[PDB]
């Protein structure tokens with residue numbers, strides 16, 4: 001039931017949202033936001049230029 | 060007396076430019092003149108397209124003239140002459156397109172129903188905040204799962220000027236849905252049509268799963284050998 | 290003489306039920322004997338500061354009878370007694386609080402501004418959603434920190450019929466504020482004046498942080514040993 | 520006389536402004552001429568259900584007399600000239616609103632119950648710390664989701680002088696409620712009735728989820744060869 | 750006459766079971782004919798602290814008697830027993846502490862100042878919420894870092910009846926401090942003195958630190 005909110009394969013961020021059916025009353029069901037971000041430790045700042053310096057800041 | 064113009068709601072939803080003035084039943088008259096006369100003077104013919112059905116209902120009719128040319132979009136001094144022998148003063152009304160109004164695109168915000176409102180478990184009011192549009196006329200329709208919702212489900216306000224903005228307007232659209240629909244996560248889409256929009260229609264959608272989250276769980280997997288995403 | 294009755298918003302801003310028999314539909318003429326008389330058979334001190342002559346098919350003498358809240362809601366059929374040359378009889382229009390209206394309290398919900406509005410960083414629109422109230426007499430005013438904002442800063446729509454409910458009404462009132470003011474965190478109270486409220490005033494409040502904690506569950510996974518698979 | 524002017528609890532709770540002309544320790548004899556007057560000498564509505572012939576042989580008469588809000592707010596000093604056989608001199612009551620009092624707004628803070636009392640699992644005492652009102656007349660009322668609670672559930676301290684401000688006063692109002700209600704979370708609003716408030720009601724509410732802040736739990740998974748995939 | 754009683758607020762502040770006499774609303778001549786006594790007549794001490802004549806034609810013959818708690822809690826009846834020139838007949842008091850009342854310990858809770866007041870930045874009010882004490886005596890004095898604050902700064906309400914408990918009482922005492930003083934982290938310890946306490950003093954501490962919950966819940970995972 002993980003609906004795919006984004007599936008960005010260029011920054012590797014995947015965001016998925018679900019309503020966790022936690023309790024009997026229909027209000028406190030938590031809207032859960034699953035940000036899954038893969039940080040390439042060795043990819044350069046410009047991926048298409050392999051001589052570019054190492055990407056350190058990942059915003 | 061009234062002469063309702065074709066707004067951008069009548070222009071876009073129906074794709075038919077209908078000049079309409081409503082003659083309320085002040086007094087019963089046989090030859091009711093709802094002749095839609097141009098500034099040029101030719102009259103596109105209309106007569107009793109639908110009865111008014113007012114509480115008095117004494118020979119009252121609505122005349123809708125389909126001046127559908129570019130002459131309305133360019134602009135002309137269109138006049139329907141409500142001239143009657145009974146109450147012998149002619150109670151006519153003139154309407155023209157408003158000229159040279161600056162065009163700013165609406166910033167459309169979809170507000171989910173309040174946490175206070177869902178605790179009542181009775182109804183949920185979704186608010187479509189169409190604001191920032193400087194041409195006055197706007198068309199707002201709600202859709203759920205790609206099907207147009209009934210116009211009795213939602214009620215949209217008349218555009219009123221935004222307070223801090225000089226001439227930009229704002230409008231609401233309150234969709235009153237039951238709480239069991241919104242808590243199950245049903246997408247309610249706000250389709251809004253305006254002249255200043257680039258594609259002429261903006262669709263904001265809201266539902267419980269997007270909403271505002273109450274538990275972000277983030278996992279910044281810092282892997283050395285990521286390279287390409289998988 | 291069309292006497293405009295004192296609306297609840299008018300008697301709430303002034304705290305004095307000043308009912309006005311403004312001389313409408315009667316042109317400028319002599320023989321001014323305007324008096325507001327109570328239905329018991331007496332009259333009070335009436336019409337302080339009547340205006341001058343404006344013969345635009347009307348006049349400008351105003352009723353300014355400072356009767357009380359316990360006087361207006363008592364059901365006393367107040368009649369103004371304007372006489373003029375066109376009609377030498379007191380035009381005793383019956384003005385009183387109607388008892389046929391149902392009395393259902395507003396359910397006032399105060400939706401915070403959308404996250405896009407703060408993301409655009411020029412304006413935030415806090416919308417007060419006064420819904421589910423049966424008499425169409427609501428006065429909405431906003432206070433920042435207990436003192437009222439100016440009426441130019443907020444705009445309140447007219448009470449419109451709630452479509453699913455039979456005779457209940459709804460009304461929405463936005464207040465457009467700067468994004469930097471909302472990010473500091475202020476109370477931004479919406480005060481709703483209505484007859485059917487238990488104390489005639491309800492007040493709702495949204496700060497910058499008005500929801501749940503939204504607890505974060507961040508996980509810096511800083512190895513390839515626990516790196517994910519596809 | 521045992522009479523009192525209307526303090527700001529019975530004028531506000533009953534919505535109607537009532538005086539008193541109660542007397543005590545007089546002789547149950549002829550000429551019971553209480554003589555309800557105004558400053559202008561006009562007679563207000565007479566006494567209903569006089570408490571005469573007490574079991575302790577004292578004369579009394581409950582001054583049930585309905586008057587407006589404005590005449591008690593204004594400069595009218597309502598004289599109640601009580602004249603009897605044993606006292607032919609009138610026992611005049613110059614009961615009115617005192618003037619010269621500086622109107623200072625209450626700064627109401629709703630203090631949630633302490634963590635130790637919530638850990639006792641028995642009761643929760645929630646405090647309406649009403650402070651800074653210079654006319655020492657507050658009527659605090661506690662409402663749960665718009666429904667006012669019973670006055671047996673909440674008790675309020677009398678208005679006591681403020682420690683570091685001479686003209687201001689303060690008051691409390693604990694609402695002792697069960698802790699199983701507080702863990703669920705209800706609004707528990709406390710309205711305060713004071714003259715200096717712009718709308719005469721300030722409503723402050725607190726439930727369990729107000730002071731709960733954004734509770735991050737970080738999980739630095741820096742080395743874990745368990746084969747898991749995030 | 751009004752025989753003023755030794756209350757626990759009056760005893761604990763002066764560390765002496767001091768009882769005064771109050772014979773006011775009388776002719777304001779300066780003649781002293783009062784000796785403080787017991788019912789047996791053995792509590793004989795000075796009739797001092799007679800103030801000046803009140804402007805509304807009344808006298809202020811007060812006097813002061815001090816004895817220990819043992820006799821005051823032993824149930825002995827005490828009498829001022831006035832015999833004055835303007836009194837046609839002598840009066841009697843027979844004053845003692847009402848025994849048989851149940852003793853329930855105060856459960857004092859230090860409610861910190863609300864976030865609405867701290868955002869105002871003008872002042873901060875800390876309330877020592879004393880609840881559940883069945884004898885209607887309390888002595889809520891405030892001390893920070895061991896030194897007692899001035900009685901002008903803190904104000905304690907009278908012990909009101911509890912809304913839901915039948916015979917218990919509650920009291921409410923606030924301490925007005927500046928907002929910058931609360932951010933420094935001063936202790937503001939509330940001291941309550943009531944007889945039902947097992948030790949007769951309870952001190953609770955309220956800081957900026959005790960209100961803040963665990964914001965961060967870092968979970969270091971290895972192997």
Ligand SMILES: *[C@@H]1O[C@H](CO)[C@@H](O[C@@H]2O[C@H](CO)[C@@H](O)[C@H](O)[C@H]2NC(C)=O)[C@H](O)[C@H]1NC(C)=O
Pocket residue numbers: 046047048049
């Ligand atoms: C990233 O690297 C690529 C490859 O070096 C850059 O693309 C070249 O850029 C130069 C200068 O702008 C052009 O003359 C070439 O024609 C480009 N080649 C291709 C195949 O695109 C690119 O500009 C770099 N981007 C950044 C932001 O540095």
Ligand SMILES: *[C@@H]1O[C@H](CO)[C@@H](O)[C@H](O)[C@H]1NC(C)=O
Pocket residue numbers: 034035036276277278749
């Ligand atoms: C968020 O929590 C769920 C458990 O409901 C878990 O399966 C998921 O992996 C978490 N999200 C991320 C990005 O790790």
Ligand SMILES: *[C@@H]1O[C@H](CO)[C@@H](O)[C@H](O)[C@H]1NC(C)=O
Pocket residue numbers: 276277278506507508738
């Ligand atoms: C987030 O919390 C869920 C439970 O709500 C848990 O299953 C998951 O492992 C957490 N995510 C982490 C630790 O990354």
Ligand SMILES: *[C@@H]1O[C@H](CO)[C@@H](O)[C@H](O)[C@H]1NC(C)=O
Pocket residue numbers: 504506736737738968
């Ligand atoms: C973080 O918090 C959630 C719920 O608050 C919990 O389920 C999860 O196990 C926590 N993370 C870790 C690593 O324990």
Ligand SMILES: *[C@@H]1O[C@H](CO)[C@@H](O)[C@H](O)[C@H]1NC(C)=O
Pocket residue numbers: 736966967968
């Ligand atoms: C973090 O807090 C949650 C509850 O808020 C708790 O269940 C969890 O055990 C905590 N994390 C750790 C590592 O103890």
